[PDB]
Amino acid sequence: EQKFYNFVILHARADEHIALRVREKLEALGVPDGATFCEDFQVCLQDAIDHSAFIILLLTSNFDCRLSLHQVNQAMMSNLTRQGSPDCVIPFLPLESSPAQLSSDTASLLSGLVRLDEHSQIFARKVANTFKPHRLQARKAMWRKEQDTRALREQSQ
Amino acid sequence: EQKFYNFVILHARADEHIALRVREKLEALGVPDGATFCEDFQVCLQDAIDHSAFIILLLTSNFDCRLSLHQVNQAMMSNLTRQGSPDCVIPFLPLESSPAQLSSDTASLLSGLVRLDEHSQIFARKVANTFKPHRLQARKAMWRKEQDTRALREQSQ
Amino acid sequence: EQKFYNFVILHARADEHIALRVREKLEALGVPDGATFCEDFQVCLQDAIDHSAFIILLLTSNFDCRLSLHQVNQAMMSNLTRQGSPDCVIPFLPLESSPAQLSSDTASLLSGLVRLDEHSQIFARKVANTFKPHRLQARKAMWRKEQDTRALREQSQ
Amino acid sequence: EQKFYNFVILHARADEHIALRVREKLEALGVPDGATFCEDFQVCLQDAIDHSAFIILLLTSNFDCRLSLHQVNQAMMSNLTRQGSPDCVIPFLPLESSPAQLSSDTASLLSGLVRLDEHSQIFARKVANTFKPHRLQARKAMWRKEQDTRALREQSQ
Amino acid sequence: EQKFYNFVILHARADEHIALRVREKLEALGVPDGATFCEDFQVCLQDAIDHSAFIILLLTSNFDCRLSLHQVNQAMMSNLTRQGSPDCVIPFLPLESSPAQLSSDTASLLSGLVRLDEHSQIFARKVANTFKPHRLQARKAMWRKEQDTRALREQSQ
Amino acid sequence: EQKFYNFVILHARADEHIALRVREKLEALGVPDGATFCEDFQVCLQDAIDHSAFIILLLTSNFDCRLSLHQVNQAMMSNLTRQGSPDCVIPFLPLESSPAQLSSDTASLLSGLVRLDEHSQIFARKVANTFKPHRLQARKAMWRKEQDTRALREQSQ
Numbered sequence: 001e002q003k004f005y006n007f008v009i010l011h012a013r014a015d016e017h018i019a020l021r022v023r024e025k026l027e028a029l030g031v032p033d034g035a036t037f038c039e040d041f042q043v044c045l046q047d048a049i050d051h052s053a054f055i056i057l058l059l060t061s062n063f064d065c066r067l068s069l070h071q072v073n074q075a076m077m078s079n080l081t082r083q084g085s086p087d088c089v090i091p092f093l094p095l096e097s098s099p100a101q102l103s104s105d106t107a108s109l110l111s112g113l114v115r116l117d118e119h120s121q122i123f124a125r126k127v128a129n130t131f132k133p134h135r136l137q138a139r140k141a142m143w144r145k146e147q148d149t150r151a152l153r154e155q156s157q
Numbered sequence: 158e159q160k161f162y163n164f165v166i167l168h169a170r171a172d173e174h175i176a177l178r179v180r181e182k183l184e185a186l187g188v189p190d191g192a193t194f195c196e197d198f199q200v201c202l203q204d205a206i207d208h209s210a211f212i213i214l215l216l217t218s219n220f221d222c223r224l225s226l227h228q229v230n231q232a233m234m235s236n237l238t239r240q241g242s243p244d245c246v247i248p249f250l251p252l253e254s255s256p257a258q259l260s261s262d263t264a265s266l267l268s269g270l271v272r273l274d275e276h277s278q279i280f281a282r283k284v285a286n287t288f289k290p291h292r293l294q295a296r297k298a299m300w301r302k303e304q305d306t307r308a309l310r311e312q313s314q
Numbered sequence: 315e316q317k318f319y320n321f322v323i324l325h326a327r328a329d330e331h332i333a334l335r336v337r338e339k340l341e342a343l344g345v346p347d348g349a350t351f352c353e354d355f356q357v358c359l360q361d362a363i364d365h366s367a368f369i370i371l372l373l374t375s376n377f378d379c380r381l382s383l384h385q386v387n388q389a390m391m392s393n394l395t396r397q398g399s400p401d402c403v404i405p406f407l408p409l410e411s412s413p414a415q416l417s418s419d420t421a422s423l424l425s426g427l428v429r430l431d432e433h434s435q436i437f438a439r440k441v442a443n444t445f446k447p448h449r450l451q452a453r454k455a456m457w458r459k460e461q462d463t464r465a466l467r468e469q470s471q
Numbered sequence: 472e473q474k475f476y477n478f479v480i481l482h483a484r485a486d487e488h489i490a491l492r493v494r495e496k497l498e499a500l501g502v503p504d505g506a507t508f509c510e511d512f513q514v515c516l517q518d519a520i521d522h523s524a525f526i527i528l529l530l531t532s533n534f535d536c537r538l539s540l541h542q543v544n545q546a547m548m549s550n551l552t553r554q555g556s557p558d559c560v561i562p563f564l565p566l567e568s569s570p571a572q573l574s575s576d577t578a579s580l581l582s583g584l585v586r587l588d589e590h591s592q593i594f595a596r597k598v599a600n601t602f603k604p605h606r607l608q609a610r611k612a613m614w615r616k617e618q619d620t621r622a623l624r625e626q627s628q
Numbered sequence: 629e630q631k632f633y634n635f636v637i638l639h640a641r642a643d644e645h646i647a648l649r650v651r652e653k654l655e656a657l658g659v660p661d662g663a664t665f666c667e668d669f670q671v672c673l674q675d676a677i678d679h680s681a682f683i684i685l686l687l688t689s690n691f692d693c694r695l696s697l698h699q700v701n702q703a704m705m706s707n708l709t710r711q712g713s714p715d716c717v718i719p720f721l722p723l724e725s726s727p728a729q730l731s732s733d734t735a736s737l738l739s740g741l742v743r744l745d746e747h748s749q750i751f752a753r754k755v756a757n758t759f760k761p762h763r764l765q766a767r768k769a770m771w772r773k774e775q776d777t778r779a780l781r782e783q784s785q
Numbered sequence: 786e787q788k789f790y791n792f793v794i795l796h797a798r799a800d801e802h803i804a805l806r807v808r809e810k811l812e813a814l815g816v817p818d819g820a821t822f823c824e825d826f827q828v829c830l831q832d833a834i835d836h837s838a839f840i841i842l843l844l845t846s847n848f849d850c851r852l853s854l855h856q857v858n859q860a861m862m863s864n865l866t867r868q869g870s871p872d873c874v875i876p877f878l879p880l881e882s883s884p885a886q887l888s889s890d891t892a893s894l895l896s897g898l899v900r901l902d903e904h905s906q907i908f909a910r911k912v913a914n915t916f917k918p919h920r921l922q923a924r925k926a927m928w929r930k931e932q933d934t935r936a937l938r939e940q941s942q
Contacts, residue, residue: 073358076384077358080380080381080384086380086383086384087200090200104467108360108364108392109360111360111388111391111392111395112201112384112387112388112389112390112391112392114199114200120173122173122195122196125196125197126199126200129196129197129200130200134158201387201391203422203423207422223394223400224394226400227390227394227400227426230426230672231425231426232426233426233698234425234426235422235425235426237694237695237698238425243694243697243698244514247514261781265674265678265706266674268702268705268706268709269515269698269701269702269704269705269706271513271514277487279487279509279510282510282511283513283514286511286514287514291472310418401671404671426672428670428671434644436644436666436667439667439668440670440671443667443668443671444671448629515701517736517737521736537708537714538708540714541704541708541714541740544740544829545739545740547740547855548739548740549736549739549740551851551852551855552739557851557854575938579831579835579863580831582859582862582863582866583855583858583859583860583861583862583863584858624732715828718828740829742827742828748801750801750823750824753824753825754827754828757824757825757828758828762786
């Protein structure tokens, strides 16, 4: 059976340490069912895209590779194609990545959206108000019905 | 569900400290359901514009950026377009911003309106008479019926 | 090599006919180096955003999709971030789209700006005074120097 | 709801101290429902003009600005246009403003009217006979019926 | 480069026909460098306010909207703030707007000023004596020096 | 530059026809530099008061409005305040206004002064002896020196 994951942090190969650091930091804030790209999904990326509610794009020095650019574009176009939830993709800015060192391409693709930064002192309220339980349960119901339709298609064949 | 907020203080990135300072100062004066731009809205700006009764434009040194100018113009044109309440936009003048240092563009856009300043000693009466409960409840009813119409439109699709 | 384009009309998939109709109408008015979103750019959107001087947002019935909303927000935030030229984004209103049928979200995002409409009889003067050659050449120089800096960054790697 | 105010003292920005000093001095003399320009009206000037019975023009050093001249002209022309009450505008002369230092323009606009001065020792009788209760109640009735007509016009729309 | 315009007629959306009718009527009388709000300025309002010498407020049936009220207040407060020229704002009364149908708010804001009406037969002398060339050249010099100061400020940054 | 005017005929809105009729009648009698209130002054009243030598108060049916009463009082008090020339204010009585229909208030304010009437056959001598050239030149010199003092005050600021 497939499990829904609350949030997913896409990251490069050499980023897993801060990936799970941020994931645990989030778990401490009261958001359950965490996930990181290289932990529960890589046993491609679309498999994580369709099974996650709110996508987290962790901007960092090693995220400037255009593979990350392809992931960002795929995630955004899938989110626009999918029904509802206009603001699932939540960019992130850890301590190790300065605001001024953001990669040109990735940051340009994220210029017109809110940015989550631990440099700010309002992180508690940011996570509290971005992850509202009601919309999260609505997303869970939407994913559950979409997976029901997927199972119907599978049974059709 | 969406929550109505009594007043909103739009501000730049490096202004949140005095933003919440002024918000708490207002809460102490007897105005409930406060709000600041970077606290309950950024998880774009129109989302805060349509869900707020009285807009607060905090003039300051770092509000001279033309992004603030765009916010001011959008707020004013939306207020003129919307029905009723000709005087929702209430400019503000904290201590850290002198009267003579007001930005040319933003202040010019606010030349022909009342200005709230803590330099004045009549601040108590200013807040008391600008935020009259009867007009505030009228604004709340107007917003509630507008959101009812919005829900009707959503259900139409 | 990359070519600068005078103006760009963003539009949905089923809009290309009136897109190029309006583009040719503009070419007839004396504005050179035209462009439409689905003609010279789609071989993502940021590629067209940074390589265009004045963005044209053609409001229409099939532009109400929130993908258009994302395009509008990205364009506006990029324009505010970029230096100079506060009024590049020029909304448009063709004949097939009535003034009263404007989409709620897209039109709300464009409430506080000038609107170009062929319903009006002052279209000649509107295009003449919005596309002033001097500011257009200033925009061309700004884009040329920005691309020179981009080439410098590319050569740095 | 709107409240009628017995008298209003128009004054500049740097005059509020003596404005409320004179207002309290008047309250001590037996005239109720006082008002000053920067206290109950600024949350434009016509809003105070139509909601006041007897206008007080406090001549002083900082009232020579031509904005005060515009206020004086607007008040006088509105009073002449309005029906009844030929002598609502009562000039004032506090202690801090000498009779010989009156501004040329403002004083010229007030040359042919009675002048209230605390330098005189007949101030008690001056206030007693200028603010006769019967004409004040007549003014209150006139304002009440005018506001009833205004409400009728509002309900017409 | 910015061009100074002799006079500007602010008007609503559905007024442009009589706007340019009156503008051409004025050009025929010997006043050069005409302008109307929806012709050379809309490609916000302050841009037209600071680049015009004598503001024309065309009272009409469709000018009663409170957006016109905001324009009137902004223009008057800017004129009072600016140095010199106490009487730039010249109200107008075309044929299609009767003297008795003047909007309550707009007309109230213009009660204490001269009114230009084509109903009167002294229109030639009215325009001749209101637009005296000497004061017009003084206004042009004032605007030129103000724009020189603005350019100095721009170069300072 | 400001021009001195020999005489001024104050009148209501619906009086301009007989106003200029009487003005031309006077010009025919040999008095130069004529003027009427609604012709060279309205582009407030004090502007005409200080720039005129001999004030003409044309009594008529439509001059009974108390605005005319305010004008009369202001003119008389200014004349008494000003130095010299005790008899500048010359009442007038045209044909269309009978001697017995004079308004109560205005006529009462003019009871103790000479009255100019075209009903009388001694009009030629009346105008000849009231407008003596020597006193007129004395008035012109007084006005010129007063305007020189006004210019000195203006230059002081």
